[PDB]
Design a protein around this ligand. Structure first.
Ligand SMILES: */C=C\C1=C(C)C(=O)N/C1=C\c1[nH]c(Cc2[nH]c(/C=C3\NC(=O)C(C=C)=C3C)c(C)c2CCC(=O)O)c(CCC(=O)O)c1C
Ligand SMILES: */C=C\C1=C(C)C(=O)N/C1=C\c1[nH]c(Cc2[nH]c(/C=C3\NC(=O)C(C=C)=C3C)c(C)c2CCC(=O)O)c(CCC(=O)O)c1C
Lengths: 503, 503
């Protein structure tokens, strides 16, 4: 069982057959560098037709003195480190200048050409500071929030986007905007939640691999990528910066009121954690390659720091809940065994994991502490690790899926964590949590997040992003990481004590 | 009491009262920013005497334009982020430009000024690309050794040092060169071992707190930090980048044949793991502060990845170990005396941690498995285990280090593996490895590491660093971290079955 939901997760965005037409995509044979593919916008950008290019060697169109470094670079195994290449394209006698961005993927050498001449300046001083002072602000951040604020302020200052946010995925791949830097121009998304389908699963899978994408304007005609005969199979554009993006996302950006967009993957343990997401409300945003990779660099630094800076918000605790634990075990070894065990130190047991009641059961006698579910009628609870093979700390809040006799018997307080303690599943330590009922602020209605069109209706994005408060029924207060390993620490140190059973 | 605190370990290296004279140290009163200390080398570097600086407010000597931004930066609570400060020092006619490095320690505002030289788009972009490429090369490393190799290559490329090593500390705080990048003509230090007293414990503890240090030339006259009347106590220079270093380290570097140095602390679990150590054979290396902190950042990233990169190693052996664990667990449970379950897998139990001998002591009671009885005067190691902090898993390269009677048996250099089961000092399993008589290559004679070259009350170091081989007994071949984790996992499985129960 995965995720796995709607028809959003299936359009193949990585082979649209087309690019964003402000640059030119070529692919080159190896080792000859014969153009086997070329986007059809080549007349405007390069002054040659796609059919003038297909079949010719790259060096034909290149100014003679730049042929050697350019061709040596393109033969290199070190492509990513060499980008951007200086390409000087010569048609008739005219020299045009481009950033060349080359990569290899799925057996194809792809070369993308973004014009480098007549564009805006990129002040050196601001680039210099965003990189050097950005590195030092991120290193010196004391918690996740400070790390996020530094990123969005540096990336906004470096790019000039109207809005740069940190967008953090949750366990169900919905996200929320946890930091925002913005021109007063633009509406705050800070605090808003967005449904998982805004960034469907095949997009998340692409973005775990290609950590940057830019749409300098959502208003463009895709330029087809033409191929020589016998090179007509779909060209994998997974790692091409000009890849034309899914029209359903381009429609979504129109409905949101954004004209240009750029986002950078945030990674943790090889998994997509979130995005740095930049949007322009009015106007285009043709961010040059060098600026983009400075933003990618800040995103890699933040990524490398993600696990550290969030753990820092718990080092204050832990040692608290660690010396708590060392008192509960100080009081099972010198004292009873386990019986009136953590029961005499009950607000150490429930200050261990912040619950309103416990529930033990060495074939007891159970033993609440208190206002547990039903007390008497909870004998349908003490079996549940005997259903899924896990041994195993069951830790939930929405008991509306795994045992929703929180609906055919409700109760509320249905916020449970339970670990087991012996082999043939019998005895159980349960912590319950009362109901902290919460308003979650969504951007537009999350239940109508996908729309259906015709006529066997196709897929369209929602049209309103107006704030939409959801009163969430079912859920407790979140099991911050420690309620499991602090419970894991307790489970095993009590098996230790329990083994003086063999007194 | 363990290791170590001897005579080298006592020079107060944090209060030399003097700095390295290529930059100037100031300390500024708060909130008034009056100069209360200043290093006597001010005339060459700054253009005035300490006599003029002391008593005067910092804004006097600062360019009028950047006066207020500089003072605001220095009154900020958050100085680390702001470094390097742009200090435009004005003395009548000339502006002199400095990197300002400010910090607070022991209640003093310390500002250190290093002559800056100005940055150029080329090679800032090149430096930026190297740091970005360096960062992703660390995150991409496939195991520990290759993270080490990547670090020394990146750091040497960034700094231009003749040599950069990873120097790793062992249990007794001796060190070893485990990775090196160098100009090929320089002698390879790779493989050399060095005694703990080369980096004595007050240095090691300072370096646990201040992670970066550079000696741009070992030939310098320390400049005294003068002070106003009434601040004449020793100024704690723990965190100053210009702090004058211990004279016995300088002459060590002289005897080693190096002219400049720079090192980066490597931290793991809050303890000094090693150094990134950079050396120049001839000539100086005034590495700019920007380049230095980029190297320190790469060291911080390496430190964050040490455990993860080691966890990647021995991929197949881990799956093998997990197999034995299942087969071992399977038969304690299918069985009378669960202890006999593992006794019947000499093959299984010994391979789990790649040992040639094991002993299980439980409720009595020793049964020995491998060719490693140490004879059944065994009841000595077992019993000594019955002290200590028996949980979790105890492990040593060299059993003599913690248990000096271990010298008497050539069958258990290792070193164990492992652990106590039922907490009470009662019941253990032990694994043994044979001893691999090997040569350790020291650089210089480690028994004359503190040579008295005259030589009464003063301390002097080695004059010779020539390779000095030594045959070592009682060291077993290191335990892999996956073998420790297998030992801990089996321990939790044995205690599960032991609790459970009757039949
Ligand atoms: C089922 C179809 C889709 C519906 C319905 C929908 O809402 N999106 C669908 C498909 C889709 N989206 C994207 C790419 C994408 N989406 C986002 C979402 C956000 N942008 C914001 O500013 C915020 C919050 C403030 C959210 C949430 C983002 C960031 C992206 C990445 C591209 C970008 O940065 O603009 C794709 C993939 C598009 C492609 O790569 O071709 C698809 C198929
Ligand atoms: C007891 C006195 C000392 C003797 C004897 C000795 O040999 N050193 C003594 C004191 C001492 N050393 C240091 C700092 C230090 N030492 C090293 C050692 C090495 N440099 C190398 O290149 C290698 C291996 C190839 C080793 C081993 C290092 C790296 C350092 C850190 C300084 C630096 O990086 O150059 C101190 C503290 C010096 C200070 O900070 O003032 C002292 C007191």
């Amino acid at each position: 069982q995965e995720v796995d939901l709607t028809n959003c997760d299936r359009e193949p965005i990585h082979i649209p057959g087309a690019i964003q037409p402000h640059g030119v995509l070529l692919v080159l044979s190896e080792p000859g560098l014969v153009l086997t593919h070329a986007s059809e916008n080549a007349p405007a950008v390069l002054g040659n037709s796609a059919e003038q290019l297909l079949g010719a060697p790259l060096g034909h169109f290149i100014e003679p003195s730049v042929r050697e470094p350019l061709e040596a670079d393109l033969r290199s195994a070190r492509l990513k480190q060499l980008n951007p290449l200086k390409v000087v394209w010569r048609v008739d006698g005219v020299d045009r200048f481009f950033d060349g961005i080359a990569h290899r993927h799925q057996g194809r050498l792809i070369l993308e050409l973004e014009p480098s001449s007549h564009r805006e300046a990129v002040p050196f001083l601001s680039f210099f500071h965003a990189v050097r002072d950005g590195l030092s602000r991120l290193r010196d951040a004391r918690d996740l929030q400070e790390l996020c604020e530094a990123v969005v302020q540096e990336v906004r200052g470096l790019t000039g986007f109207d809005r740069a946010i940190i967008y953090r995925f949750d366990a169900e791949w919905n996200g929320s905007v946890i930091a925002e830097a913005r021109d007063a121009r633009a509406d705050p998304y800070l605090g808003l939640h967005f449904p998982a389908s805004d960034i469907p699963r095949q997009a998340r899978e692409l973005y775990q691999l290609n950590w940057l994408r830019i749409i300098p304007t959502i208003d463009y005609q895709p330029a087809r990528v033409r191929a020589l005969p016998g090179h007509g199979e779909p060209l994998d554009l997974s790692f091409s910066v000009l890849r034309s993006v899914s029209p359903i996302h381009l429609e979504y950006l129109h409905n949101m009121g954004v004209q240009a967009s750029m986002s950078i993957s945030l990674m943790k343990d090889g998994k997509l954690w979130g995005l740095i997401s930049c949007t322009q409300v009015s106007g285009t945003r043709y961010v040059p390659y060098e600026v983009r990779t400075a933003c990618e660099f800040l995103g890699e630094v933040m990524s490398s720091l993600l696990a550290a800076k969030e753990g820092n918000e718990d080092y204050d605790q832990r040692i608290r809940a660690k010396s708590i634990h060392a008192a509960l075990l100080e009081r099972m070894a010198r004292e009873v065994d386990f019986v009136s065990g953590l029961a005499s130190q009950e607000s150490g047991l429930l200050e261990l994991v912040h619950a309103h009641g416990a529930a033990i059961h060495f074939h007891g006698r159970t033993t609440v502490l208190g206002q547990a579910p039903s007390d008497e009628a909870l004998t349908g609870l003490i079996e549940w690790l005997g259903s899924r093979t896990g041994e195993g700390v069951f830790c939930t809040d929405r008991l509306a899926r795994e045992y929703p006799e929180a609906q055919a018997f409700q109760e509320v307080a249905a916020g449970l964590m339970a670990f087991s303690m012996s082999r043939g599943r019998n005895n159980f330590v349960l912590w319950f949590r009362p109901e902290a009922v919460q308003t979650v602020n969504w951007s537009g209605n999350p239940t109508k997040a996908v729309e259906f069109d015709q006529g066997g209706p196709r897929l369209h994005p929602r049209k309103s992003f107006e704030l939409w408060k959801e009163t969430v029924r079912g859920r407790c207060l979140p099991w911050k990481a420690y309620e499991v390993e602090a419970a894991s620490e307790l489970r095993r140190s009590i098996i230790d004590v329990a083994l003086q059973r063999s007194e």
